[PDB]
Design a protein around this ligand. Sequence first.
Ligand SMILES: Cc1noc(COc2cc(Cl)cc(CC(=O)Nc3cnccc3C)c2)n1
Ligand SMILES: Cc1noc(COc2cc(Cl)cc(CC(=O)Nc3cnccc3C)c2)n1
Lengths: 304, 304
Amino acid sequence: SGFRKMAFPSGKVEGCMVQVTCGTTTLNGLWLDDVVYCPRHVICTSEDMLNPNYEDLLIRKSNHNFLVQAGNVQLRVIGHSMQNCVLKLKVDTANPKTPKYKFVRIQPGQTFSVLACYNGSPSGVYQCAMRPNFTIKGSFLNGSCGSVGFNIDYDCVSFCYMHHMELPTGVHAGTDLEGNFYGPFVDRQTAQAAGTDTTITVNVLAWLYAAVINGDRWFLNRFTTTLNDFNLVAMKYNYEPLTQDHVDILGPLSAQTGIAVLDMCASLKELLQNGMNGRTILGSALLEDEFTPFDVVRQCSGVT
Amino acid sequence: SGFRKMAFPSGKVEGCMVQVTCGTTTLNGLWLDDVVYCPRHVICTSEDMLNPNYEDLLIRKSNHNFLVQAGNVQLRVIGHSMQNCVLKLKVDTANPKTPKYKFVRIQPGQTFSVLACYNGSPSGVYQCAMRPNFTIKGSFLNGSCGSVGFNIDYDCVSFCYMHHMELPTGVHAGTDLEGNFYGPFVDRQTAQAAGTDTTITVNVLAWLYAAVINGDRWFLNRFTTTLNDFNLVAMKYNYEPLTQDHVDILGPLSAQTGIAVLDMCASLKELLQNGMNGRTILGSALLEDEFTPFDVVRQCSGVT
Ligand SMILES: Cc1noc(COc2cc(Cl)cc(CC(=O)Nc3cnccc3C)c2)n1
Ligand SMILES: Cc1noc(COc2cc(Cl)cc(CC(=O)Nc3cnccc3C)c2)n1
């Protein structure tokens, strides 16, 4: 028993982290096969971040202008290209530590582990969710750009995120591994609206199931509700509407606990309308939404 | 900016995880140099866990009775010994992936990363603290025994904890890497009192400094306090007494924010006496105590 924000083991990703320097700028790169991926703002100086013409800036760069360092050995760059907001540096050496990998674009509400890096060196690993407004609430500093988010399916690492930017609001924005930003963000020093962020209802419900599995049952009641009645409560509290797909996704957790999804929704409804009244659920005084039903099943079953 | 419960990169520890089988029982082992470390209750059956005579049970075992598997290759056991509550299986092959390591006994209030494992395979990594009552609030299942806790100082992994047991209260107990249990716990199926657990005051204060560094300043006030006045509030709320050593340990965070420790204590005093009033600090509705002043400095500075 016990329930924590558990990140994936980071080993397979640590072996892919390199350092990328372009002029004055140094950020992290991802070395997979003979290709290093990194945010394209590596070619920029502070002066041209207001409105950079990336194609024009890339033109003034050559293969030899991109310094790629793998721990201590210098990688030779034989190619460079821009794919959306990422630069792809073809190096003459395939990464001997390249794991089985995929590049996937995660859906908002899904979770992933982040290996925060500085100068191609990992500093820590934490679990987080792609918020419904496509921002992430991570922990990043100057130099963290190029740090990646991923998931692991047995031996296959699915790379989903590359950190590019901190917005003035303190939230983090980035791209998938093809360079497409999650959300409406642009890689330039300009005013950018993050958008209204709602709570991932299916994740809060899954975490309520984790609480029941882990002994915390104070919030369970003698009531039930309907999808349409629950959704009226969800709208008032800026919660994502619960669909039948979400109910089905919560099926394994419903079967494991013997608590119907709509009975759990009535517990959530009471918790939303009345609060915790000073009590805790799994050591938390607020409703947690960064655990998918999949994360709950995995953690409570012990999937390696 | 941003602040998360960040675990250490787990790679160096993943390369040390092996599977240990003794009869019907299978748990995790730690392979460092030519020695595999694992909880000694691996030699037990469910029938003798009520009051096991470990010396007597170990006598009925020979080197060939201990099955050590490193991923897929069988390790040959040429020695076995019991050191307190851990068994030390001398294998004929040194671990090629042995990192620079130390065995340390952490102090209560200190934090460490746990690589939760099942069948010698890592499933996840999370950060936690040794509670003042020497229990840990981790996430462990049947088979997780042998999972280790550690810290990393540049290239050196300091092993501090080995998971042995879940208590009926849901908390977790274990040993240092010499087999000495943290706390008054014994490795036997018997009634065991965890003891009153207090809040790590120096950690809550350090996390209040992380909040100020990360923009959350609503809780800062026009007041100050003394060590003796603050401690009267700490006792009433089951908080660890704050000493001058703790004030000194918070020195770097005091200098970085320009907020004197005793001014921060008066903010904590008001928060304890009045609560959050429905507000959050770093996304939390309760006072977090599993971040040492060291963890805060490391995360807010970007130490790799
Ligand atoms: C100086 C300067 N030059 O440009 C800027 C602002 O515009 C940008 C635009 C882009 Cl695409 C990227 C960046 C890097 C960044 O945001 N890093 C970062 C990430 N996560 C946490 C903290 C930090 C500092 C800055 N200031
Ligand atoms: C069956 C059975 N045999 O003994 C016992 C109870 O006594 C013990 C005594 C010891 Cl020293 C160790 C264990 C293993 C254990 O506690 N595992 C564990 C760890 N963390 C989370 C979940 C689990 C299940 C059981 N039941």
